[PDB]
């Protein structure tokens, strides 16, 4: 139940589909080690691993749900790692696609009721609600998201 296995667990469907490069997992772990991405929300801790590099073939969001939170060092420094159960692996090939999706997730995170239900949903329900939220906006077109990219961890 370490962070490296979580990175591999969420990277697996993107390497199989061809959304990211085969060595993507190593680049994103090195990125997390150099610059951690843990966030302490007023609700539940969230991590958003991303590499911002040129290895990724296309844009994708991979969403993992953990029953047993893992300590991720904070984005905004601080001495206390944040326990994270929800992991958003973000792939994209430009600065703008990553930043716009970061803004979109920001709007998602501050929706308290969504997050509270999110903690207790099946993988298909997560797929439907995230898919709906992505499609509702006119931006963020061209980012792949499929049922295979939403999974529970153990």
């Amino acid at each position: 139940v370490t962070q490296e296995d979580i990175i591999r667990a969420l990277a697996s469907p993107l390497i199989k589909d061809g959304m990211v490069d085969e060595d993507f997992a190593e680049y994103v772990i090195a990125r997390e080690n150099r610059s951690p991405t843990g966030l302490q929300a007023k609700g539940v801790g969230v991590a958003i691993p991303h590499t911002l590099g040129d290895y990724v073939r296309d844009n994708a969001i991979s969403v993992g749900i953990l029953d047993k939170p893992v300590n991720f060092s904070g984005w905004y420094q601080s001495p206390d790692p944040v326990p994270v159960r929800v992991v958003f692996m973000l792939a994209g090939r430009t600065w703008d696609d990553i930043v716009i999706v970061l803004k979109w997730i920001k709007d998602v995170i501050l929706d308290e009721e969504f997050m509270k239900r999110l903690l207790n949903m099946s993988d298909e329900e997560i797929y439907r609600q995230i898919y709906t939220r992505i499609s509702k906006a006119p931006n963020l077109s061209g980012i792949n998201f499929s049922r295979e990219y939403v999974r529970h961890l153990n």
Partner: antibody
Amino acid sequence: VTLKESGPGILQPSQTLSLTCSFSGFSLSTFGMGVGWIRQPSGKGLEWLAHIWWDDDKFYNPALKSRLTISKDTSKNQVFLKIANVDTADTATYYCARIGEDYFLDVWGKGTTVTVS
Amino acid sequence: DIQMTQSPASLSASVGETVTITCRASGNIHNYLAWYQQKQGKSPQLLVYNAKTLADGVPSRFSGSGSGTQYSLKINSLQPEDFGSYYCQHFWSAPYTFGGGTNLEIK
């Protein structure tokens, strides 16, 4: 909103059967909707075989994955179940049932009987 | 793969008593559980969904309960129309496997 089923009555072992579900009053293109298949051997309980969601993805029970294929056709409101290499053990009642929004089998057909000679 | 256990193997009850049945999951499935009743020669019908919410057209005497991995159904003031085979279904992840069920017989 009535579901209807049709298929072979008595078939020979090892061939492939094709069970067709007709839909009426319901559209299979609607977000959140889908349909599945239920098998009930005589004298036994029921078991889940497969279902399809509005987006044409597919899920199959791993134990019988090698023998299940479903072809979805929104036009003419049809779902085709192809079951290969039928064994003696596959004699059962089959049902077409809607998966339903919020995950529940609200509408059921009358069922059909499949007997392996 | 998620497996599920139905208990007891069979129940024995008379008309007018309140009885309960239990469905226990092998993993944490939250509230993605539904209960159905099948009559001999008839297709199963839905009783309760989302573990606790009663479906339209189903009498209020049906009530779901439980939490986590263990859920139950209580049926009060049992009437002749309510006897048959009861099943639970779990919608947490595919395959959507079923329990073994129980036969409730008129005594």
